[PDB]
Amino acid sequence: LNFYLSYFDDVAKVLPREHYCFIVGGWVRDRILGEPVGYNIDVDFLTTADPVELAKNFAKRIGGHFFVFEKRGFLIKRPTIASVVLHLPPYRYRFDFSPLKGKDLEKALIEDLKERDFTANAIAVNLDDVLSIGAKQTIVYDPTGGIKDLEQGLLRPVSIENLKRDPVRVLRGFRIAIEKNLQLTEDFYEFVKEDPRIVLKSAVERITHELFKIMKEKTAHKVIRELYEYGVLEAIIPEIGRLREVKDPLDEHTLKTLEYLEQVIEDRAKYLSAELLENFGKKRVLGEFTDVELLKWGALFHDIGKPQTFVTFYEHDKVGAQIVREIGERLRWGDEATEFVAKLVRHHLRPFFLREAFKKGELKRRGMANFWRECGDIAPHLFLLSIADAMASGDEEEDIKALMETIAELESFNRNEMKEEXXXXXXXXXXXXXXXXXXXXXXXXXXXXXXXXXX
């Protein structure tokens, strides 16, 4: 009843008569927790069938085109997982399929469950048991006793060795703990305390994926703070640790910048214009993530250049862009993604300048047009980041209002004031280049002043 999903039926139709499937990990966990199903559904499976064929035909039934990547060999037993990803804008589906092999089915299932990272993820149920019609409580498999830990609200790794085998999970342990609101056990925290840099063992792609999963949630700032306190964030991103040596506290300012940024993004309807809000957050990166996570990375990286420069900081913020680019290359971020974050960091101080020009009444069509021309793409993100950084810097409420009103002045100037009205009038790319220069003069006796300014 609780464990039911519609597509499971399709699985049962694809699943061979002599082969079985088991619902494992996150889905059963969240289902026991009694959490309402979100817009993202991820279900892990353990099957005795061929995962490739099973997931391929399931993918033929529901769409969600077939995904199989792993190496095959005589041994060591090399896992092959086949996933189905069905993506429509409001809802995303991911079904994982993993091989289950052995002479004793139950012993093999238990054996596989004991290898998993945490007790909450070690709970597995049988597919045929979920589809079972009545007169029984569907049997659950938790040799690690995940249910008991979930009842006590504790997130306990099965064994520390499992964490040392796959270090990236040490990130999950934090994230889930904040995401499902669970308290991690003592042995975990102690293990992280002993050797924080262990996370560097696992592949970089999975690290990036996990960190993006962290940046996805609205509680992200807490998890980031937790990763920074244990030195994990410094191990993954050495540049963040360098924010430590420059004293005004820059690191606290950055964490608070993120924490405030989340609240601002929640309030984004207030400050931002509707035309900006329409296309905001709808830009996909890495196939499961949006530009919002890039905005949060833009909050963490908002000043990464202040430690590099030293009385005042001047040219760093551009340097911030370069550093962000380097990290993006090292962390295997998407090209357009790391370019977006870099561009977001580069201009991070721009709305403050326009604000200062607004408070003095110096802000005019020239500065606005220059702004929107230079960056119109990162404009909303830059606005939210500017407001957040204004909240984190302890700016006066009047000054913050000046920033918001400056932002909305830019937006109002763009949505309505800015209109191109041509080549036939100028003659009354040599003509196109002079048309762009005359356009900048209109965005900042009339015809003669434009013809003279062009030559």
Task: Explain what the structure shows.
This is CC-adding tRNA nucleotidyltransferase. With 455 residues, the chain is α+β, with helices and mostly antiparallel strands. It has three domains: 1-145, 2-Layer Sandwich (Beta Polymerase, domain 2), CATH 3.30.460; 159-235, Orthogonal Bundle (Hydrophobic Seed Protein); 237-417, Hypothetical protein af1432 (Orthogonal Bundle), CATH 1.10.3210. Helices cover 55% and strands 10% of the residues. It is built from 26 helices and eleven strands. The strands form three sheets. The protein has a seven-stranded mixed sheet with strand order 3-4-5-2-1-6-7. Strands 8-9 form a two-stranded parallel ribbon. The chain has a two-stranded antiparallel ribbon with strand order 10-11. Strand 4 and strand 5 form a beta hairpin. The longest helix has 21 residues, at 397-417. The termini are far apart.
How much of the sequence lies in strands comes to 5-15%
Strand order of the largest sheet: 3-4-5-2-1-6-7
Q: In CATH terms, what is the architecture of the largest domain?
A: Orthogonal Bundle
Classification by helices and strands: alpha+beta
Number of domains: 3
Shape: elongated
Percent of residues in helical segments? 55-70%
What is the makeup of the main sheet?
7 strands, mixed
CATH topology group of the largest domain: Hypothetical protein af1432
Gyration radius, rounded: 27 Å
Q: What is the CATH level 1 assignment of the largest domain?
A: Mainly Alpha
Q: What count of helical segments does DSSP give?
A: 26
Q: For the terminal residues, how far apart are their CA atoms? A: 78 Å
Count the beta strands. 11
Binding site for CTP: 26-29, 116-117, 121, 166-175, 206
Protein name: CC-adding tRNA nucleotidyltransferase
Catalytic activity: a tRNA precursor + 2 CTP = a tRNA with a 3' CC end + 2 diphosphate
Binding site for Mg(2+): 42, 44
